[model samples]
Target: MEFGFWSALYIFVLTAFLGYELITRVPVILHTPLMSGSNFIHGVVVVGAMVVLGHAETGLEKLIGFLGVILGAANAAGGYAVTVRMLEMFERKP
Candidate 1:
């Protein structure tokens, strides 16, 4: 099924608000663990970047796709790195 622009916008706005609300309601103590667990969510962004690259046919489109891949990979990698650092902070010394 296809969605109109208004429908897509509404869904986007609703999800954005819902995500904000959910995140804001979490306790401070759980934030780090939650963030670390959420790192996998960036896989969707990586898949989206791949889709953009796969659909590109022109030079400009290819450039945009390349940039998207770079940005998405960086974002996912950075999130994982930050999560690892946070987790290490919670690790007890032997």
Candidate 2:
């Protein structure tokens, strides 16, 4: 199985644009809440990345897969934690 250059280029461009939008759009006061919500969505990428990496048999494939896993997990963990904390701030403990 071979991935073409266009696939790589597409992902690079998409990620760059998405990252820029994420960082710049959130207001300072709402950054934490917004990011936390986004983190949950990001977590889904972890499963996708892990599947790709696990199926990859070559070095280049492995590298890309692993990078995906790392980025996905990072987003998930940060997002989930921040979101939970923000919600907890407003919750009444029983």
Candidate 3:
């Protein structure tokens, strides 16, 4: 199926709304947990970009995928760092 720009935009907007609805419906206590969950998604993002880059057949494809894979990996790494910092609050430290 051909997904046009409009279709892609619609999917993006609808996904945002769906996320908003989900968080709005959940308890406030779950907010940080939900944020931490984004680490898993970011990890998947890096993995997917690596697959795309690894299978790329053209220089342009490789360039684009490399950008995504590198940045995606960085962001995913940062996401894990964030979760660890958040978890640090639970330890018995002054």
Judging by TM-score against the true structure, name the best candidate: 1
Q: Per-residue error at 36 for model 2, in Å?
A: 2.2
Reference-based lDDT, each prediction: 0.80, 0.83, 0.80
TM-score of each: 0.64, 0.56, 0.60
Native-to-model Cα distance after best TM-score fit, residue 94 in candidate 3, in Å: 6.9
How many steric clashes does model 3 contain?
A: 0
In model 2, residue pairs whose N, Cα or C atoms come closer than 3 Å (at least 3 residues apart or on different chains), thus clashing, are none
Over 4 Å off, model 1? 1-25, 36-40
Residue-level lDDT of model 3, residues 1-94, one tens digit each, is: 1389888888988988987787777767656966886754657688889999999987999999999898898778877787777767767966
| Candidate 3 off by > 4 Å | 1-30
What are the per-residue Cα lDDT tens digits for candidate 2 across 29-91? Answer: 776687678667768899999999989997899999999999999888877877888977767
Clashing pairs in 1: none
Candidate 1 lDDT for residue 38: 81
- Higher-ranked by TM-score: 2 or 3: 3
